[PDB]
Amino acid sequence: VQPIKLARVTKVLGRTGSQGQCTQVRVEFMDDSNRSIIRNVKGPVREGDVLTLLESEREARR
Amino acid sequence: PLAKDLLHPTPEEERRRHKKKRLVQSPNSYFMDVKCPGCYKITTVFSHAQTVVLCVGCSTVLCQPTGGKARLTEGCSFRRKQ
Amino acid sequence: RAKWRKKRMRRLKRKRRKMRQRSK
Amino acid sequence: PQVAEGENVFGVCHIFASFNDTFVHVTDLSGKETICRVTGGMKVKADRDESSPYAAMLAAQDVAQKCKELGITALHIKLRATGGNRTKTPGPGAQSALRALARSGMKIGRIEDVTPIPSDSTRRKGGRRGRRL
Amino acid sequence: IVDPFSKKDWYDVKAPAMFNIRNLGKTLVTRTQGTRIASDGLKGRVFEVSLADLQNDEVAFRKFKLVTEDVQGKNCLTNFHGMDLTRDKMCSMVKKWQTMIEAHVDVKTTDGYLLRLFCVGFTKKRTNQIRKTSYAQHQQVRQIRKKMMEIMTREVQTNDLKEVVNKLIPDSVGKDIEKACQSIYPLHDVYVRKVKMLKKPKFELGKLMELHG
Amino acid sequence: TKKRRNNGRAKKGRGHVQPIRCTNCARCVPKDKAIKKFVIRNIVEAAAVRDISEASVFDSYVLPKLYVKLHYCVSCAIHSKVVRNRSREARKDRTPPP
RNA sequence: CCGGAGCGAAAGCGUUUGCCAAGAACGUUUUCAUUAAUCAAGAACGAAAGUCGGAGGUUCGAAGACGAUCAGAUACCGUCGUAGUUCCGACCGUAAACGAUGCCGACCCGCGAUCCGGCGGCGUUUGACCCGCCGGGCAGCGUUGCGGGAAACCACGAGUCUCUGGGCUCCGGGGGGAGUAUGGUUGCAAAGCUGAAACUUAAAGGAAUUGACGGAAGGGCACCACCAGGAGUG
Ligand SMILES: [Zn+2]
Numbered sequence: 126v127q128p129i130k131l132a133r134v135t136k137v138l139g140r141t142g143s144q145g146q147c148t149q150v151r152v153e154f155m156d157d158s159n160r161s162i163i164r165n166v167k168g169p170v171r172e173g174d175v176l177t178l179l180e181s182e183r184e185a186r187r
Numbered sequence: 188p189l190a191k192d193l194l195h196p197t198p199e200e201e202r203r204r205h206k207k208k209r210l211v212q213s214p215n216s217y218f219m220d221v222k223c224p225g226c227y228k229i230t231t232v233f234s235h236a237q238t239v240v241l242c243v244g245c246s247t248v249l250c251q252p253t254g255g256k257a258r259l260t261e262g263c264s265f266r267r268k269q
Numbered sequence: 270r271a272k273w274r275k276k277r278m279r280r281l282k283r284k285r286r287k288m289r290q291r292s293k
Numbered sequence: 294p295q296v297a298e299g300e301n302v303f304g305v306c307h308i309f310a311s312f313n314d315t316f317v318h319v320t321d322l323s324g325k326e327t328i329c330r331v332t333g334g335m336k337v338k339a340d341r342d343e344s345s346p347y348a349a350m351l352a353a354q355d356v357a358q359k360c361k362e363l364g365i366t367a368l369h370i371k372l373r374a375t376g377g378n379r380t381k382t383p384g385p386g387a388q389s390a391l392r393a394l395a396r397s398g399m400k401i402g403r404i405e406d407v408t409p410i411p412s413d414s415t416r417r418k419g420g421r422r423g424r425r426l
Numbered sequence: 427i428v429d430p431f432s433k434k435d436w437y438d439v440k441a442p443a444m445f446n447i448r449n450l451g452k453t454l455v456t457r458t459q460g461t462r463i464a465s466d467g468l469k470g471r472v473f474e475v476s477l478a479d480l481q482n483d484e485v486a487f488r489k490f491k492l493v494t495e496d497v498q499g500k501n502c503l504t505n506f507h508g509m510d511l512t513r514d515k516m517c518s519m520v521k522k523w524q525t526m527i528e529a530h531v532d533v534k535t536t537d538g539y540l541l542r543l544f545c546v547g548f549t550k551k552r553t554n555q556i557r558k559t560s561y562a563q564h565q566q567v568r569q570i571r572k573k574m575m576e577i578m579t580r581e582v583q584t585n586d587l588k589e590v591v592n593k594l595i596p597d598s599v600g601k602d603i604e605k606a607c608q609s610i611y612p613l614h615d616v617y618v619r620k621v622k623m624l625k626k627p628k629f630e631l632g633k634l635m636e637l638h639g
Numbered sequence: 640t641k642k643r644r645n646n647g648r649a650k651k652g653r654g655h656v657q658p659i660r661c662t663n664c665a666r667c668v669p670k671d672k673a674i675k676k677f678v679i680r681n682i683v684e685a686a687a688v689r690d691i692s693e694a695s696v697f698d699s700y701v702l703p704k705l706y707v708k709l710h711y712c713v714s715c716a717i718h719s720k721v722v723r724n725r726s727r728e729a730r731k732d733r734t735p736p737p
Numbered sequence: 738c739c740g741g742a743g744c745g746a747a748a749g750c751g752u753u754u755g756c757c758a759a760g761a762a763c764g765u766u767u768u769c770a771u772u773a774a775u776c777a778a779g780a781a782c783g784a785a786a787g788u789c790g791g792a793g794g795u796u797c798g799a800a801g802a803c804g805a806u807c808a809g810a811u812a813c814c815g816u817c818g819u820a821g822u823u824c825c826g827a828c829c830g831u832a833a834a835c836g837a838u839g840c841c842g843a844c845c846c847g848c849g850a851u852c853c854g855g856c857g858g859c860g861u862u863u864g865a866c867c868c869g870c871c872g873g874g875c876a877g878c879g880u881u882g883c884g885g886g887a888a889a890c891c892a893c894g895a896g897u898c899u900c901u902g903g904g905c906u907c908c909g910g911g912g913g914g915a916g917u918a919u920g921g922u923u924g925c926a927a928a929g930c931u932g933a934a935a936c937u938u939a940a941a942g943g944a945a946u947u948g949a950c951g952g953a954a955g956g957g958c959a960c961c962a963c964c965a966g967g968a969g970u971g
């Protein structure tokens with residue numbers, strides 16, 4: 126059990142996935158910058174946007 | 188090396204090449220006058236002694252057999268002859 | 270395969286000796 | 294175990310991070326006394342993901358709770374793959390179980406890798422033509 | 427039904443005076459219930475502890491096995507049982523384009539402690555060496571391996587168990603071998619990778635109290 | 640036709656070498672013909688080195704490494720994209736890729 | 738550690754130490770003085786598997802059983818598992834036993850490394866290392882090979898063959914039938930060596946080129962493809 130953490134995308138790494146539907150990006154927290162995790166994103170995302178990841182624990186293995 | 192003089196080679200090449208592959212074969216060995224530091228008698232010793240050479244009627248050892256040239260004992264001066 | 274054709278000939282001439290040794 | 298200032302009561306965590314399963318085994322310094330042992334298969338019901346990093350993460354969070362109830366504060370990590378005659382690379386549950394322990398409010402110290410390696414192995418399973426598929 | 431950790435009472439393992447950090451850690455065991463007691467269950471535990479956790483500032487790639495020999499009032503005393511290097515240290519020294527010279531002896535100390543020391547040494551590449559491979563001929567390896575066995579025998583047979591451990595916390599036996607074999611072939615990473623305690627003499631309380639005293 | 644001058648292996652002046660077994664298929668492959676790959680990687684990947692550093696009980700503790708000697712047969716090394724096919728003239732380059 | 742490194746006639750050979758005999762190369766202003774090279778019928782050795790008699794039997798695993806997978810699956814995968822796998826004595830003498838390249842000798846390009854012996858040179862480090870030379874050995878690159886060959890490729894020659902001749906042994910004669918039948922011979926057996934014919938056939942095959950194709954790799958492009966969706970259609 127972990128709290129719903131907010132994260133702001135700092136730089137998009139490009140489109141990923143099988144059919145190219147996901148967008149692997151690296152996020153950056155706003156409250157505490159002592160954690161950096163890469164997360165896949167499914168949908169059109171600009172630069173500097175904010176996503177709401179739930180797990181915030183597991184990686185995506187690039 | 189298209190026109191090389193095979194009859195009159197420089198002495199640096201004859202000295203460098205193998206003793207059998209020379210124009211006229213000649214041994215790379217010689218004889219030396221090993222002088223024991225204690226005694227005074229001169230004994231002719233082959234370069235590659237191949238045998239433990241000692242002074243006749245003494246105790247000091249002159250040479251030691253090795254793979255190539257003999258290893259003379261310390262202080263045993265020598266000179267080659269021709 | 271050529272190694273199995275050799276295996277069949279070995280098993281073919283092996284039973285030929287059986288039907289030939291039994292008639293003597 | 295009353296310690297002044299609440300010092301770290303060190304334990305030894307044996308992580309058998311092989312394939313098809315992942316053992317998160319926490320013992321004392323001698324290893325003879327088992328504090329808590331939970332595997333990746335104990336947290337999932339499908340046999341295909343017993344070695345999944347998610348299954349090993351849940352086991353690391355469960356074993357970290359049992360250590361706090363008994364007084365263990367720090368853990369000495371001893372990662373171990375299948376080893377021996379078989380493969381010697383840790384499974385996918387190695388990084389997940391180890392990271393989940395550090396994120397579960399536990400202390401990590403003296404990381405090591407004790408994998409059984411032979412000075413001369415026996416004959417491995419599978420013929421000389423290998424597991425072909 | 428009942429929780430098994432209700433009967434677990436903690437003991438404090440201690441190290442002999444050969445180390446600086448004497449307080450080693452804690453160990454748990456069930457209380458004395460039934461015919462079995464809690465003392466004999468603690469007299470067989472081995473503790474593989476790194477050297478940096480026993481000395482103030484030393485290397486961390488050298489481990490020490492400490493077996494418990496007696497329990498004296500809630501803290502059980504330990505004794506030297508065996509030395510071993512870290513797998514990371516052993517795999518990092520074994521490189522390519524060089525030779526490794528291993529040697530093992532079976533020497534008993536002044537007291538009846540039969541030890542089996544394992545030495546390992548690698549040839550060192552010269553500073554101005556242009557040739558890639560730094561190999562030693564078989565006869566040079568034999569003289570180096572013979573020198574390892576000659577020094578390890580002299581440094582152990584003429585000392586007691588305490589002095590050998592004091593010669594193992596710093597790898598003095600590894601340094602003199604590297605210096606002795608300098609005339610044969612310059613060695614690089616001479617270490618004593620492992621020390622097995624094959625036979626142990628009759629346990630007496632006076633010898634154990636002399637160590638921890 | 641002869642595809643390689645070294646017959647796909649490294650054996651000059653010998654008759655038999657000790658056959659080793661592959662890693663992901665356990666096939667008996669000669670020691671010189673096997674495609675070796677020494678991988679030296681940390682026990683903790685870069686995605687978790689920060690979490691271990693925060694949970695470390697020491698002040699300056701360098702994380703260890705995991706030395707793995709991998710022996711791949713020609714069938715599995717190509718399938719795992721460890722080695723690939725090259726041009727007829729680009730096969731002679733023995734220098735490893737940087 | 739372990740290498741396109743070493744040794745051995747090959748097969749083959751990798752923990753320490755001791756013992757026994759043997760060997761190449763190098764060194765020699767030692768000795769014998771043609772004793773040599775290659776060699777039918779003979780003979781030693783000879784991977785793995787297999788056979789016979791004992792000891793042993795951890796792993797692996799023919800056969801076999803079972804669980805999957807599939808149209809079927811006595812296969813591939815998985816779980817158990819016999820003979821074997823190890824050692825001793827005695828047989829079999831077979832491999833993609835390969836460098837698919839017999840052995841001895843002569844001439845024939847260059848360059849940089851490597852292992853062993855020897856020789857010389859200037860320092861560094863307590864023999865090691867550095868720079869050359871000689872002999873032998875495992876190899877490599879440049880040869881766009883002075884040459885060869887149907888190419889591929891070959892300087893461990895596959896070079897010095899129409900400008901055809903250093904010595905000698907084995908061995909090939911279109912593809913199948915066929916390493917079969919029979920005979921001889923060897924073996925406990927399995928089989929080895931020797932080994933045809935009737936008949937059948939116009940090709941089989943070698944190297945390379947272009948194209949097509951791949952449940953081969955890399956790099957790219959369209960909704961007559963897809964992801965996310967909108968309309969449907971059936
Ligand atoms: Zn493989």
